[PDB]
Amino acid sequence: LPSIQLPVDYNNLFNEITDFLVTFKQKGPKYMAMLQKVANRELNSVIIDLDDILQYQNEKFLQGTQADDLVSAIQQNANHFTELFCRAIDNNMPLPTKEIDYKDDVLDVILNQRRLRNERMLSDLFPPNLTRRYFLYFKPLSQNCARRYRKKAISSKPLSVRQIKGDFLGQLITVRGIITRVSDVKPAVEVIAYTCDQCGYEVFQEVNSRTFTPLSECTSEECSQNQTKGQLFMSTRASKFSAFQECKIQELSQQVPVGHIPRSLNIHVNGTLVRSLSPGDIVDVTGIFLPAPYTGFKALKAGLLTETYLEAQFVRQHKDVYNRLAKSIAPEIYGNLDVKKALLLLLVGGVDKRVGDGMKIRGDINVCLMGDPGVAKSQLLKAICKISPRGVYTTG
Amino acid sequence: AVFGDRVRRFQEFLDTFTSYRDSVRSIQVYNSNNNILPHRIIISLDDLREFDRSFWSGILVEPAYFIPPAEKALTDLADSMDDVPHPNASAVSSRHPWKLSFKGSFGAHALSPRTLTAQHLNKLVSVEGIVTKTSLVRPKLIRSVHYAAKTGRFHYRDYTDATTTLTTRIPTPAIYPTEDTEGNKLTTEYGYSTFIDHQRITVQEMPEMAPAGQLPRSIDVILDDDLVDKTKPGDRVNVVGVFKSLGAGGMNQSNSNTLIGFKTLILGNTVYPLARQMLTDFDIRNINKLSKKKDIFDILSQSLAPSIYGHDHIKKAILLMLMGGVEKNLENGSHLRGDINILMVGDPSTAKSQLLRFVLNTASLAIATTGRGSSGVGLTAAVTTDRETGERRLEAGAMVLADRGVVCIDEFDKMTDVDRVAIHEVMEQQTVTIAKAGIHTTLNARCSVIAAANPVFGQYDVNRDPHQNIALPDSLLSRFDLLFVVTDDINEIRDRSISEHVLRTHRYLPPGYLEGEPVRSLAVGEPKLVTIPFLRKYVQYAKERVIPQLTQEAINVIVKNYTDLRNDDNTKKSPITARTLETLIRLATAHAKVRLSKTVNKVDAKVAANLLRFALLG
DNA sequence: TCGTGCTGAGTGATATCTGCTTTGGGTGGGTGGGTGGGTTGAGGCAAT
DNA sequence: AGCAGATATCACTCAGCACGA
Ligand SMILES: Nc1ncnc2c1ncn2[C@@H]1O[C@H](COP(=O)(O)OP(=O)(O)OP(=O)(O)O)[C@@H](O)[C@H]1O
Ligand SMILES: Nc1ncnc2c1ncn2[C@@H]1O[C@H](COP(=O)(O)OP(=O)(O)OP(=O)(O)O)[C@@H](O)[C@H]1O
Ligand SMILES: [Mg+2]
Ligand SMILES: [Mg+2]
Numbered sequence A: 001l002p003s004i005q006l007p008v009d010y011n012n013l014f015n016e017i018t019d020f021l022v023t024f025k026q027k028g029p030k031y032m033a034m035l036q037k038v039a040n041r042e043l044n045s046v047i048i049d050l051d052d053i054l055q056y057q058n059e060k061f062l063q064g065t066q067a068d069d070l071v072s073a074i075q076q077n078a079n080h081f082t083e084l085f086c087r088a089i090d091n092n093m094p095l096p097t098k099e100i101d102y103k104d105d106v107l108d109v110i111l112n113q114r115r116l117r118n119e120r121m122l123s124d125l126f127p128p129n130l131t132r133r134y135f136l137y138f139k140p141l142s143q144n145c146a147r148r149y150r151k152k153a154i155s156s157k158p159l160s161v162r163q164i165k166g167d168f169l170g171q172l173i174t175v176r177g178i179i180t181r182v183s184d185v186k187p188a189v190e191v192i193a194y195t196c197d198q199c200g201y202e203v204f205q206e207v208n209s210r211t212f213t214p215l216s217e218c219t220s221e222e223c224s225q226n227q228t229k230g231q232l233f234m235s236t237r238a239s240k241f242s243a244f245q246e247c248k249i250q251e252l253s254q255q256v257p258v259g260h261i262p263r264s265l266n267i268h269v270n271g272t273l274v275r276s277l278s279p280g281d282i283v284d285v286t287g288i289f290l291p292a293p294y295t296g297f298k299a300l301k302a303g304l305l306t307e308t309y310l311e312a313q314f315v316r317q318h319k320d321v322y323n324r325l326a327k328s329i330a331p332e333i334y335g336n337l338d339v340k341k342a343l344l345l346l347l348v349g350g351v352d353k354r355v356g357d358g359m360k361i362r363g364d365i366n367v368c369l370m371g372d373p374g375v376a377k378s379q380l381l382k383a384i385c386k387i388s389p390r391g392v393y394t395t396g
Numbered sequence B: 001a002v003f004g005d006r007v008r009r010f011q012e013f014l015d016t017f018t019s020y021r022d023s024v025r026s027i028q029v030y031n032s033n034n035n036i037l038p039h040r041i042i043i044s045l046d047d048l049r050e051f052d053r054s055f056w057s058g059i060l061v062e063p064a065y066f067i068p069p070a071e072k073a074l075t076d077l078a079d080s081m082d083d084v085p086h087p088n089a090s091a092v093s094s095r096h097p098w099k100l101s102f103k104g105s106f107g108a109h110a111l112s113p114r115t116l117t118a119q120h121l122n123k124l125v126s127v128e129g130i131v132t133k134t135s136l137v138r139p140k141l142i143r144s145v146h147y148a149a150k151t152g153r154f155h156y157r158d159y160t161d162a163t164t165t166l167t168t169r170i171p172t173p174a175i176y177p178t179e180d181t182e183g184n185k186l187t188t189e190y191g192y193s194t195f196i197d198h199q200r201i202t203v204q205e206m207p208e209m210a211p212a213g214q215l216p217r218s219i220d221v222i223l224d225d226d227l228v229d230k231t232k233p234g235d236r237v238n239v240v241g242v243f244k245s246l247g248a249g250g251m252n253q254s255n256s257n258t259l260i261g262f263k264t265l266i267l268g269n270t271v272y273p274l275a276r277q278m279l280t281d282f283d284i285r286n287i288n289k290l291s292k293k294k295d296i297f298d299i300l301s302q303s304l305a306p307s308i309y310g311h312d313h314i315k316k317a318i319l320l321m322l323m324g325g326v327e328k329n330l331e332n333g334s335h336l337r338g339d340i341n342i343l344m345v346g347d348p349s350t351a352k353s354q355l356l357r358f359v360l361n362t363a364s365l366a367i368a369t370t371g372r373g374s375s376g377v378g379l380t381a382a383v384t385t386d387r388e389t390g391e392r393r394l395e396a397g398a399m400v401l402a403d404r405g406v407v408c409i410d411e412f413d414k415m416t417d418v419d420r421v422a423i424h425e426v427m428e429q430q431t432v433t434i435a436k437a438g439i440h441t442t443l444n445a446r447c448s449v450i451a452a453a454n455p456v457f458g459q460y461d462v463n464r465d466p467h468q469n470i471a472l473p474d475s476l477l478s479r480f481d482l483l484f485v486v487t488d489d490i491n492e493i494r495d496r497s498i499s500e501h502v503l504r505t506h507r508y509l510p511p512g513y514l515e516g517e518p519v520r521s522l523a524v525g526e527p528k529l530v531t532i533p534f535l536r537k538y539v540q541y542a543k544e545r546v547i548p549q550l551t552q553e554a555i556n557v558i559v560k561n562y563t564d565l566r567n568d569d570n571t572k573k574s575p576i577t578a579r580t581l582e583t584l585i586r587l588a589t590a591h592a593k594v595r596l597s598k599t600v601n602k603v604d605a606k607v608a609a610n611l612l613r614f615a616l617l618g
Numbered sequence C: 001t002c003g004t005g006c007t008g009a010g011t012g013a014t015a016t017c018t019g020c021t022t023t024g025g026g027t028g029g030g031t032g033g034g035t036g037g038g039t040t041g042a043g044g045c046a047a048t
Numbered sequence D: 001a002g003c004a005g006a007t008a009t010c011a012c013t014c015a016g017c018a019c020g021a
């Protein structure tokens, strides 16, 4: 494992992040207020705006106390900075201002009893992610703010699926396309809680992979000491789960080159961003491009070839009365007033269908157009289908 | 020991020729200024042979031992040249060495997929063929960078593969290190790790060059880094690489076959297109001067298919189709195509197939299909699986492949309705819709369709109406801008002229051939009829740098012609319709493109009207 | 007939090393099966 | 990497005898 000397000092960056969270203002600090809201169970998602970081860096440079470029470091490698920001938030979480029912939560009771057991043992501990009740996301650097401060915004620059290469892995990038598939929301396990039948103690496990091996044997101090062989049993009540959704984003027609087939890129949605993407909507998904290593025999058989996906971080969603309406239905065509009026009547389709005797007169004013080639039948079809909210265009 | 000597010798070679140093400096300057140019340098094998015979011979016959030294020397030269003040952390951790590229003359190593044999293994070769397959692009892991929080130092690992390096090395599983040497936990730094793109293509021997009675053969090629997306299926390429062998090839006890050979493929160094002709200042001036002639249209039309007697109007239509109109898409959503479709229905032996072959050869992009030889799926797109990745995908069809090109359909009437439907959709919408195996996509298919067909009876009958003569659907017929009905009429003067022309053509002999002798590259990188290459250059120039706009006089002429043609007692071989107005506008725009004119004038409208009138009423 | 070792080889037992094989895909086959999956496209055949 | 079979080296139980009580 030979070492390298890279020009990054994570301690200074952590100090920068803590100072930004504590002092940044844009009343009191914005992020301090956000953390106060999170403490009172009022907010379950914290979003870090890179524009705020850039403004803070500019202010620090102006004051003369030049600091490290945090925006570039976040953009180049965002996976580490998620954990760094989570740690910084944890170290400065304000005390709750609104009383809450602590005893209701199972985790609170379990940890309190673990503390009691530890105190008893001493008289003779848990992963930080377990107790976290919030999600962290990165908002890309807006183009306007970057141009104001004379900087290039790689994160917010839209890219096609083709333009996302292997050299972009591990960075915060934006993708433009049309969602073609969204899966059902399912629970993804992050921390697993076990129990000992003999010991009476609780064990925990962290999952950061596609697959995991469950525990079988107790590892507690008591068990070890006493030599008691106790079996570990999974407990889903005390485990931590996060909503998971997998989506497919495909290239737009105008983005494909000449004589090429469109390509698709996988998207992973975690936390509160779930249900923000639906099929058929053109979106600007911002996320962290990361690989998905295999495990076990598959890993060995696959080789160096790696799958990839996008960790969703931000989603931007793209956008005389009778005669007048008839004429405005399809201005491009030559005036056909009667046909346009019939199309209006079909579109509105007003009817009172409440017979209640077993059947009810059909409530649809069906329209059929038949004519020799040359009339703009296709144009009427396309226009009237576009205007209609539920209009569906099909070919026999 | 020898590696260092070879590195030093290649450093001396690079120093002697300053062109490569200047190219590297220019690439570095461009990259620093700013989208980016890959770290690749094209060197001439002739210069290397002139400088040092031993190094050139070694590179040609033993690339595995002579290429890596040259690459290292070039990388060292570039690094010494680099003067970037602050190197970014990713730049420091990046594994981006310069890659060498070759050109010149491969004396006996210039081969094809058919002539590649075991004797050429582990040698630098040049392969020429047609791309038939193209795997999906996926990243490949070469270096991994890790961080240890307690120690505060970054640890890295390097990976290798059978295809990533020329020299064999111990295989490295992709398992990310998890723990340090002393037991310290490690965190993967994806942003600082290095991944490179990987792709596999299949190059096929050109069918025309295949032996008699044997189907073409193909060879697999591996492309990495910047050569990932330099080709698409149907392209003619000249690939340079090192022929290699992979795997045990049954040597292992697990394979009981004992009759199976090794795997073989090529690690591509260059991809040389074989489509767009570079235009020189002299060529541009000649094109302008020729275009300034009043009768440029006549000369250009006559220059097409000199061996075909007559058919002047069909030749003019083919020229206008090649030039093509202007494609306009409106804000509301309506799309107006600029492609011109042509259909020919006539008696046997009327030069329809020969015209199709000529337009196939002349057009920059063209795909040939037959009626009985094609299918609906084969026209549109097929669902298949990717070998490399094992992922369900789409394979481009005839229509798709010919995007922004021309598709020639022979025996148009010998098809099936099932097959016909695909074409109908293609022409009507210029897009392909696929709903198979959980695939939902729209494929762009913007191609001009030129087809030939025969009457139902096999011979056009004047007595019977046009509808009875042609069995194709009216809806499909209406999409063709021009319909030409050509008949074989027996006349003494015309018969004598045609016979004399055919006899004169059949007496042609090629240069450098003796009488009675039957008809059987040097480098890799490299009223008078107009020669075909000049015609191709003219077509490219006109179709690239001209977008004619309509004017009022042309509009007056067009509307006058439409009003006269649509409401006239004289019968027409094809019915008049509002599509005829669009056809007239398209033909006027194409004729304007012929003259390299920014505006459509009265002459263009008159020519379009005359062509349409001839096509309709003969 | 209790207590305390010394002898002891027998009868364990549990802490400890030696070899598959797998995923899925033809870089294991068709003397492992097609009701354990793959699987859309072309082709030939009979009833229609 | 995980799992199932196996080897071999680790203790523990009943066995019984010498002294004296
Ligand atoms: N009234 C009109 N004004 C302008 N353009 C028209 C008009 N009617 C038809 N067209 C043109 O006719 C062209 C072909 O006709 P279109 O596809 O609209 O309908 P259609 O002839 O009924 O179709 P089909 O051939 O599929 O039966 C269209 O491009 C449209 O521009
Ligand atoms: N005008 C012509 N000038 C010279 N040769 C001609 C001409 N018309 C036909 N031929 C000869 O006809 C021969 C075969 O005819 P061709 O294949 O071109 O016919 P086609 O129009 O495709 O007819 P079909 O497919 O109905 O048989 C060609 O070798 C060509 O030499
Ligand atoms: Mg229509
Ligand atoms: Mg023919």
Ligand SMILES: [Zn+2]
Residues within 6 Å of the ligand: A196, A197, A198, A199, A200, A201, A218, A219, A220, A222, A223, A230
């Ligand atoms: Zn326990």
